[PDB]
Amino acid sequence: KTSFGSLKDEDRIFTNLYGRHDWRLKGAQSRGDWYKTKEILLKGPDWILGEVKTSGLRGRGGAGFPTGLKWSFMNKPSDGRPKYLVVNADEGEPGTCKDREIIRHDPHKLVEGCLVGGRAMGARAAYIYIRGEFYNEASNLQVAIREAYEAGLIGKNACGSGYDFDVFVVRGAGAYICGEETALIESIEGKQGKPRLKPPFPADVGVFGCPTTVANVETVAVSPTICRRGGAWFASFGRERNSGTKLFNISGHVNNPCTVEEEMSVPLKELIEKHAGGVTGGWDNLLAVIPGGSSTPLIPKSVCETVLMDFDALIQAQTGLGTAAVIVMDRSTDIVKAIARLIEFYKHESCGQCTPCREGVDWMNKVMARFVRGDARPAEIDSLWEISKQIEGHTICALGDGAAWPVQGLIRHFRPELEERMQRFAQQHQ
Template structure:
C-alpha cells in the first residue's frame, strides 16, 4: 500500500535505491524532459507557479529564492542541499534519502540547472554518515550513467555533485552557518545581507534548499506548477512530509496534503491512530522544537503555513511533537532549553547568555527551588533574546518559552508555589531529571 501522495508514493518499492528501479518508475524522465527542452528561466517560472515553499522550516517560496541569483555574475554559482536535519522532532529527510536517494540526485541536477550552477554539495549532519554512503552510491550510479559530469544527458550542461559530512552541530542547519562549515570554518552564522543568493559559498551566488524541497523539483518540472496545486490550500500548495513523535500509537513520517487538520493526523487510523496507553493530548509542538506549543484545544487547526500562524505557531520543518497529559511542561521546556543552551554557537550574547540563564531558571523551577518572580524573569529573558540575536537560533530558543508560558503558565507558577509538578505524573519513571 502506498504511504503517501507524491514523495512517499513509491518509496517502499524494493530496490528503489538502485538506478534501474528508480528509472523504471519514471526516474530521471524529468531531467531528460528538461535539459535541452526548457530554459533555466522557464524552470524557475514553473517552480514559482507551483507555489512550492521551502520545506526546511522557513517556508520561503522556492522559485522566488532561485530568482534572486544574479544572472550576469561572472562568478561560479552553487546549489547546496541542506541535509543537516537537526531540528528536534524532525526525521523526514533521513527516511526520504535512505529510501529514495536518486530523487535527491535528480532534484539537485535540475535545481542546479535552473539557477545556472555547475556544482552542487549535499551537506549531511555528522550522524548521517550511513545516509551519506547511500547517497554517494546513487551519485556514483548517476555518474556512470552519464547523468553527472561534463555533459549531462548529452545536453552540453556540465554538473558535478558532491556530499559533505558535518560533525555534530545544530547550528549548521542555519544556511549561512552551513556554508561556513562547508568552507572549513567553525559553523557560525554570517550576517545577512548579503544573502547567499548573492554571496554564499566561497562568496559566490548560492542557493541552499532543504532535501524535501529539492525532491519536489523533479515532479514539478515534469508535471507543471498547476498540477502540484492539486494538493494543499491556496497559499500552502502541495504536500508536506510530517514527522510525528511522542506517545502516539504509530509515530513516523506521513505525507499529507497541506491543510489537513492536525487532529486528523494524530487521531485518524490512516495516520497515527490516536494516543497510546489511554493518554490524552495536552499540547502539540507542530513544526519542530523551535516553534511555540499549542494546547489540545487548538488541534483542529490545519497543517498549513497560514492556519498554523493563525493559532500562534508555525508549520516549520513539520516535526510534530505530541505531548501527553502526564507530562510536566516545566520538565518538557527544561529539556528543550538544555538543547538550545548546548547548541548555541556562542557568537552573539543574547543567545549564548540568554539560553544559559533560561536553563538556570528552569533548573531551579524543576528542582523545586523556584523563586517568586521566576516565571516573569524567564519570559523576560526569552523576550530579550527574541529578535535580538544574530541568527534564528536565538528566536528558536525563545519561542518554546513564549509558547509554553502563554498556554501553560499555571504549571510553572505551581512549581514555584508548591515545589513540585502540577500534573499527576504517572509517567514520572519515564521522564526524570538527568541533566
C-alpha cells in the same frame, strides 16, 4: 476545495519513503525518477523557475520562504564567480527525521533535484551538506551519485543536455547550528559553523564567496516532480499560499510514530488519528503538541482540535509550521521537564557567536532547570518572558528565536502549572 488530507498514493512525490522498493537507479527509474530530465534541462532556467513559482512551493526547511522567488535570486548573469546549489541535509531539529528518509530511500530523487535546481539557478555544482551522524545515509547517497555519474545523468554533459554539473557530498561533524544556511556555508568552508550576518544573502556572497542557494532536501527533491507533473498539479493541494504535499514526522506519545507524506492543510487531529494511530490513551489523553519540531511553540489540546497543518493556520495558532515535525505529549508528561530539556538542547546547540544567544540561552536553561523543580518564585516567569523577548530578533540567526519560542509557548499555555509547581516547592521546602 475546503477540506484537506486523505492524499492518494498516485499523488505521492516520495514514493519509496519506507524502503520497501529499490532505492538504486533501476528502482528509481522504475518509479519515475530521471524521466525526461534532458527535456526539463533544455527548456531553460526561466521555465523551471516558472514551474516552481507556479507550484506555490515554499521552503521545506522550516521557514517557508517562496522557493521560486528564492531560486530566482540566482537568475542573473555571471560576474566571473561560479554559482552553487547547496543542499541542506543537516536536519538537526528534534522531532525531524524526514530528510534522512529522503536521502536513505529516494537518493536519486535528491540528485535529480540537485540537477534541476542547479540548472534553474545556473549553478556549477551541488554541495549536499549532510549530517555527519547520517553516515549510512551519506554512503547511501554516494552510491546513488556514483550510479548517476556512471549513467551520464550528472557530470560532464548531464543527461545529454550539454550542461555540466557535479554533485558533492560534504559530511557535517555534529553541530545543529550547521543547518542554518550561512553557518552551513561556513562549515563547508572549513571553519566553525558560525552564522554569517545577512546581508549578504548567499545569492550575493555564499559558499566560497560565490552566488549560492541553500535549499532543503525536501524542497529540492520535489522539484523534478514539479517540473514533470506541472506546477498546477502541485498547487492543487493545500490552501492558497500553502501548496503541495509535506512530509510529517509524528513522534512522541502516539501509538505508531512514523514519517508520512500528506496533503498540506491536513488537520492535526486527522493526521495523528489516521497515520500515527492516535495519541496513547485516546485523544482525550492529549496534553500538548509541538507542531513543527522543537523551535515551534507548543499548542495545547484545545488548539489541536481544529488546527490545520500548514504555515498560515499554525501562524494563526501563534506557533509555526516549521519542519512539520509533530511531537505529541500526553497527560502523563512533565511538560516543564520536556521544554527545559529542549532549552538544554538549545544551549548545547548554540555556536556562541552573538551575545543574546550565548548568554541568554544558558540563562534561560538555568531558569528552566529551576522551574522544573519549582525552585523559583512567580515573578521570575514574566522575567523569563522578557529574557526570551531580549533574545528574539536580537541575534544573528534564528536559533535564538528558536530557543525563545518554546519558552514563550510554555509560559503562554501553561503558566498555572508552573505556578502550582513553584508553590508546592515553597510549601514543602519552607
